[PDB]
Design an enzyme around this catalytic site. Structure first.
Site, mmCIF file in Angstrom:
data_model
loop_
_atom_site.group_PDB
_atom_site.id
_atom_site.type_symbol
_atom_site.label_atom_id
_atom_site.label_comp_id
_atom_site.label_asym_id
_atom_site.label_seq_id
_atom_site.Cartn_x
_atom_site.Cartn_y
_atom_site.Cartn_z
ATOM 1 N N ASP A 130 26.765 -7.830 11.365
ATOM 2 C CA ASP A 130 25.513 -7.065 11.412
ATOM 3 C C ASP A 130 25.068 -6.770 12.849
ATOM 4 O OD1 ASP A 130 23.089 -5.929 11.001
ATOM 5 O OD2 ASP A 130 22.342 -7.538 9.699
ATOM 6 N N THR A 131 25.434 -5.584 13.352
ATOM 7 C CA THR A 131 25.061 -5.212 14.697
ATOM 8 C C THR A 131 23.560 -4.993 14.858
ATOM 9 O OG1 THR A 131 25.475 -2.870 14.290
ATOM 10 C CG2 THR A 131 27.308 -4.162 15.131
ATOM 11 N N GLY A 132 22.829 -4.838 13.763
ATOM 12 C CA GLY A 132 21.376 -4.708 13.765
ATOM 13 C C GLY A 132 20.618 -6.005 13.792
HETATM 14 C C1 LIG Z 1 19.274 -7.862 6.505
HETATM 15 C C2 LIG Z 1 20.382 -6.859 6.298
HETATM 16 C C3 LIG Z 1 21.193 -7.155 5.058
HETATM 17 C C4 LIG Z 1 19.738 -5.496 6.003
HETATM 18 N N1 LIG Z 1 18.959 -4.957 7.121
HETATM 19 C C5 LIG Z 1 19.647 -4.407 8.317
HETATM 20 C C6 LIG Z 1 19.600 -5.484 9.453
HETATM 21 O O1 LIG Z 1 20.504 -5.078 10.488
HETATM 22 C C7 LIG Z 1 18.181 -5.617 10.058
HETATM 23 C C8 LIG Z 1 17.693 -4.395 10.855
HETATM 24 C C9 LIG Z 1 16.289 -4.591 11.469
HETATM 25 C C10 LIG Z 1 16.183 -4.786 12.855
HETATM 26 C C11 LIG Z 1 14.919 -5.003 13.457
HETATM 27 C C12 LIG Z 1 13.790 -5.059 12.649
HETATM 28 C C13 LIG Z 1 13.884 -4.932 11.266
HETATM 29 C C14 LIG Z 1 15.137 -4.707 10.678
HETATM 30 N N2 LIG Z 1 18.211 -6.744 10.950
HETATM 31 C C15 LIG Z 1 17.527 -7.890 10.700
HETATM 32 O O2 LIG Z 1 16.765 -8.132 9.707
HETATM 33 O O3 LIG Z 1 17.790 -8.830 11.744
HETATM 34 C C16 LIG Z 1 16.879 -9.987 11.804
HETATM 35 C C17 LIG Z 1 17.792 -11.125 12.343
HETATM 36 O O4 LIG Z 1 17.948 -10.894 13.762
HETATM 37 C C18 LIG Z 1 16.703 -10.332 14.145
HETATM 38 O O5 LIG Z 1 16.931 -9.262 15.039
HETATM 39 C C19 LIG Z 1 16.508 -8.077 14.345
HETATM 40 C C20 LIG Z 1 15.347 -8.516 13.424
HETATM 41 C C21 LIG Z 1 15.913 -9.879 13.000
HETATM 42 S S1 LIG Z 1 17.482 -4.112 6.681
HETATM 43 O O6 LIG Z 1 16.778 -3.704 7.995
HETATM 44 O O7 LIG Z 1 16.703 -5.123 5.763
HETATM 45 C C22 LIG Z 1 17.851 -2.647 5.673
HETATM 46 C C23 LIG Z 1 18.058 -2.765 4.299
HETATM 47 C C24 LIG Z 1 18.509 -1.590 3.665
HETATM 48 C C25 LIG Z 1 18.700 -0.388 4.362
HETATM 49 N N3 LIG Z 1 19.097 0.764 3.738
HETATM 50 C C26 LIG Z 1 18.527 -0.335 5.756
HETATM 51 C C27 LIG Z 1 18.138 -1.499 6.390
#
Ligand SMILES: CC(C)CN(C[C@@H](O)[C@H](Cc1ccccc1)NC(=O)O[C@H]1CO[C@H]2OCC[C@H]21)S(=O)(=O)c1ccc(N)cc1
Ligand SMILES: [Cl-]
Ligand SMILES: [Cl-]
Ligand code: NA
Lengths: 99, 99
Positions: A25-27
């Protein structure tokens, strides 16, 4: 490997001697895994995602294998819907995004 | 490019005539953008992540330019804390994870 994104980038990880499935998960800044027992002490952390914030347990310096690559670093434990490997361990396994 | 993951993989996108910053997110199935107007029809959807669910508007057949590469696909619009380019559009620009 070179992983395309037509399907979720799911890999096998090994932590505490147990195999689990996790999403590359690059996000995600940080690695977050579903409830399990880990050794040592933990510290509190809040992480914010798409629906809001959750509390997690932060464990540092945890040995974890990701798709056959060894990493040792921070693992957050909490009510994440899927196990996610975030950038803190993607950097340890040498992962890059390419296009 | 090749993008390392020491930092968040943020890029500039152009959508609906607007330039925005967005996160290249292999952990997102779908592309989710902060509130904006887009042309055409939409339908409501709920999407879930860490934290729970949000309600979004689903627009289909939307063109986005991502770091200079044109792609078309579904864009979800709603109260996401970050603009996210998910796999549905990452595939179209030929993005891969490599290690
Ligand atoms: C949790 C994943 C299965 C899904 N997510 C993408 C994910 O990359 C999110 C993307 C993301 C990023 C920032 C803010 C909210 C969501 N990252 C995330 O929740 O990371 C958390 C853990 O490390 C922290 O750094 C980022 C927030 C924390 S998501 O944002 O809930 C999502 C769900 C469905 C869709 N279509 C698009 C996105
Ligand atoms: Cl699509
Ligand atoms: Cl391909
Ligand atoms: Na449309």
């Amino acid at each position: 490997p070179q992983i395309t994104l037509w399907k979720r980038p799911l890999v096998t990880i090994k932590i505490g001697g147990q195999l689990k499935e996790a999403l590359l998960d690059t996000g995600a800044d940080d690695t977050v895994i579903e409830e399990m027992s880990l050794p040592g002490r933990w510290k509190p952390k809040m992480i914010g995602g798409i629906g809001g914030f959750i509390k997690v347990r932060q464990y540092d310096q945890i040995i974890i294998e990701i798709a056959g690559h060894k990493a040792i670093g921070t693992v957050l434990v909490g009510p994440t819907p899927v196990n996610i490997i975030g950038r803190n361990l993607l950097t340890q396994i040498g992962a890059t995004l390419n296009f």
